[PDB]
Amino acid sequence: GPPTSDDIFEREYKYGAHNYHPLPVALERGKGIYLWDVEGRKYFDFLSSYSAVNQGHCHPKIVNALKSQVDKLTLTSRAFYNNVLGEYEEYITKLFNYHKVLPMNTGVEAGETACKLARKWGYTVKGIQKYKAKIVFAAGNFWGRTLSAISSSTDPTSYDGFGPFMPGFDIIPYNDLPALERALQDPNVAAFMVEPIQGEAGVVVPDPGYLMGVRELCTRHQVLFIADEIQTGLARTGRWLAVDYENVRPDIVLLGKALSGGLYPVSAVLCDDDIMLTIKPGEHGSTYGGNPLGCRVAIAALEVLEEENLAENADKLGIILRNELMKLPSDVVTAVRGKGLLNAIVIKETKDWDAWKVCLRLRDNGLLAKPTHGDIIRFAPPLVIKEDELRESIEIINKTILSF
Amino acid sequence: GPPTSDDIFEREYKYGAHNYHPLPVALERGKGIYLWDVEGRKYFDFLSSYSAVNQGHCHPKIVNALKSQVDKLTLTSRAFYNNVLGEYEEYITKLFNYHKVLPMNTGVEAGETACKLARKWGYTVKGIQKYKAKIVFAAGNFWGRTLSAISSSTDPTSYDGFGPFMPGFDIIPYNDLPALERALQDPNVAAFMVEPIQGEAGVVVPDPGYLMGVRELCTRHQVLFIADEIQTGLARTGRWLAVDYENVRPDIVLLGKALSGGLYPVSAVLCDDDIMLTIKPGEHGSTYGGNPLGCRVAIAALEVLEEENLAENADKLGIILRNELMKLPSDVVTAVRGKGLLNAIVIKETKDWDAWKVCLRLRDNGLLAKPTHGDIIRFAPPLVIKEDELRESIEIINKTILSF
Ligand SMILES: Cc1ncc(COP(=O)(O)O)c(CNC2=CCCC(C(=O)O)=C2)c1O
Numbered sequence A, B: 001g002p003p004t005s006d007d008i009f010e011r012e013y014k015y016g017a018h019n020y021h022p023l024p025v026a027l028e029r030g031k032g033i034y035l036w037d038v039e040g041r042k043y044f045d046f047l048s049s050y051s052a053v054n055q056g057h058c059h060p061k062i063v064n065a066l067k068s069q070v071d072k073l074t075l076t077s078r079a080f081y082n083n084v085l086g087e088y089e090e091y092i093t094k095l096f097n098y099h100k101v102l103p104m105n106t107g108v109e110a111g112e113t114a115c116k117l118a119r120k121w122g123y124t125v126k127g128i129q130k131y132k133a134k135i136v137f138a139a140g141n142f143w144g145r146t147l148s149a150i151s152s153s154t155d156p157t158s159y160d161g162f163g164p165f166m167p168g169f170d171i172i173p174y175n176d177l178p179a180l181e182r183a184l185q186d187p188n189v190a191a192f193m194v195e196p197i198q199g200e201a202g203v204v205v206p207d208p209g210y211l212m213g214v215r216e217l218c219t220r221h222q223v224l225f226i227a228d229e230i231q232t233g234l235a236r237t238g239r240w241l242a243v244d245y246e247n248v249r250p251d252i253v254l255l256g257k258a259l260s261g262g263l264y265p266v267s268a269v270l271c272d273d274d275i276m277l278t279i280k281p282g283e284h285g286s287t288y289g290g291n292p293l294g295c296r297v298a299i300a301a302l303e304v305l306e307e308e309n310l311a312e313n314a315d316k317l318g319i320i321l322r323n324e325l326m327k328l329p330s331d332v333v334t335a336v337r338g339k340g341l342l343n344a345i346v347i348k349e350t351k352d353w354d355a356w357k358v359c360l361r362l363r364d365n366g367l368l369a370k371p372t373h374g375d376i377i378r379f380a381p382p383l384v385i386k387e388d389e390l391r392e393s394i395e396i397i398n399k400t401i402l403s404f
């Protein structure tokens, strides 16, 4: 017979690194908002791979693009041109209204590319002396697991025991304009990288006006405003970009995750010529970056978000989700927050009952989520979910929470 | 009508970053050893995307694995278990005879993971004080484009203008055992990372006994021997791993590129429990690392290399290629080197005639290659090439070289 869920857990423990502690569930099928485990049980996916399957699992139009291109050409390396990359570059740069895109594969690679752009721009355009360029980050940031990315983290589990660390990274509190103004008095600051909503930190939503204030301060001190929209972008928060809520145009925009609908690792660095062209030929790249298969997938993935109006759906349905979640008892749910369909609740941890137990029982009742930083449960279903399906999920949440 | 090759070049220049200068050819189809441009012209691929399509372009068994899995499930995130990862982990760890694998996506991510393992092992097992752990690299190394990877490079085009740089990375000459012995007198060295054959540097083959000497020195000083086999592994040099030529077992093995046959970004970090388990749950990972679609592709990709005996083919055919290349006139070809089907020739550059011009004319005559570091042309066709097809390619090389 096939392997059971426990067999699947047991096998990974024996042969795979122990760098995760996943929730005890073993999935083998996904379609739209639903996942199925190897026992055949059906679950609502309320994580969406942390917003990488915004378009739902195995969306037929993205699947069709992958199957069609894989019969033609999948990788030449950037030693040669392929016929797809430029069609995708034109499409994505028009869509977000930046002059150029640099293609990469993973979110952290886009972040690393952004820091390289910022330093090279800082040295060659702003006039900072080599190598005094600084990049400022916000406490609670997450942008990946390279040595550079953990060097800016304030989470000791990310960086403790992995040093020495990348120099030139300063940290200030999130959602704090006086702190950014103070930090930007240093003329050697080249960039400030920030998430419009902090995902891994627990859907930390900054106050209204924060992104407007970041834009103004960065311009006033000619610092590059790097917006990490790898988790918040692509309709998840109710707009094409989370920064659209404040009509703000960052200097560099990072995309990833849902850029492929979950079918391929595709990430992107968007910015205008004055920044993008400080990197000259031979000075940056990637084996798989810009390959034609990922490019066909990402075009189709972006078309799904636009043609199915997923941003407005995420907006309307996010209002319903948060209003219903706020009806839960304060003794159990300490906070509800989010924008669009990127939301989270905070569980009043005791000696016994905590967010991990809630997620175990959510799983028992047919809904999959997971805690972050202990007491914060993220609720982030695919943007293709319908109102009826959302309300059925809310009743699962209510049944679970009100069962303790 | 469709876009011409020049239209394709023009479009990328307008909308994509200028971080590469590819050879002027615009490919739209690949199958086995052949590529076709948008004009319909057929070329021998003598780069294999720098050994990412060892199995040939669009190998039907790898394509079948991707099409089959994409209808089931492509990404859950490591928040949950998927049913494929453990089957791939068991398969790949048995094949190379290491206890555990850590899955990632790109080659540089595997390199970053290796450096994090080395430092965490250095601090928690060897007893190095935080944060004095050192990692030694060889001059000419290439392992990617993150800020950490360029921090160990000796190529100014990689690191100049991108600092300040990651501390704790020392550099010694390649192919130099006295230098490694001298460097390893420092008790704060945690690891030595090295390519068995340096790819990007120009297929720099170390002398016989070098890898044996590296293994002994690393053991004698309890330093981790990290073998970067992302370009040399997976049958390209004529064995499963290039280190197999000297019967050497590194402490960490990195794989990538051909790990997927070019269909998906899949990379791997292989090592035993004593190193792998110094990273605890929550301390390292990746959105797409270990996803079930990449895992199905990599299983099929690895099966192709074994079942079609591509290593022995690469061995036998590499002997023919180098012997024929050594018949070229010394006035034009200054050196021939390589193992298996990872080979290179060195062109005696003049004021006018150089390796770029040779590659332009190779392209004119139906064979695609590209220079590295100016005067070095790599010859690396897919391992599925047959002897007759190889000899037809050699005559193209002869016609081109003997036409100047
Ligand atoms: C806001 C933000 N920026 C960058 C990244 C890094 O993306 P990668 O593709 O993982 O390198 C992230 C990643 N966030 C994650 C989403 C899902 C799973 C995951 C993990 O298991 O590490 C991270 C991000 O959120």
Ligand SMILES: Cc1ncc(COP(=O)(O)O)c(CNC2=CCCC(C(=O)O)=C2)c1O
Pocket (backbone or CB within 6 Å): A077, A078, A079, A285, A286, A287, A288, B049, B050, B105, B106, B107, B108, B109, B111, B142, B143, B144, B145, B195, B199, B200, B228, B229, B230, B231, B232, B256, B257
């Ligand atoms: C020996 C070796 N180690 C690591 C890497 C990095 O792999 P990535 O997947 O690119 O991060 C490489 C990469 N070598 C390359 C092969 C093809 C194309 C390419 C590029 O355009 O940057 C690099 C490697 O060789």
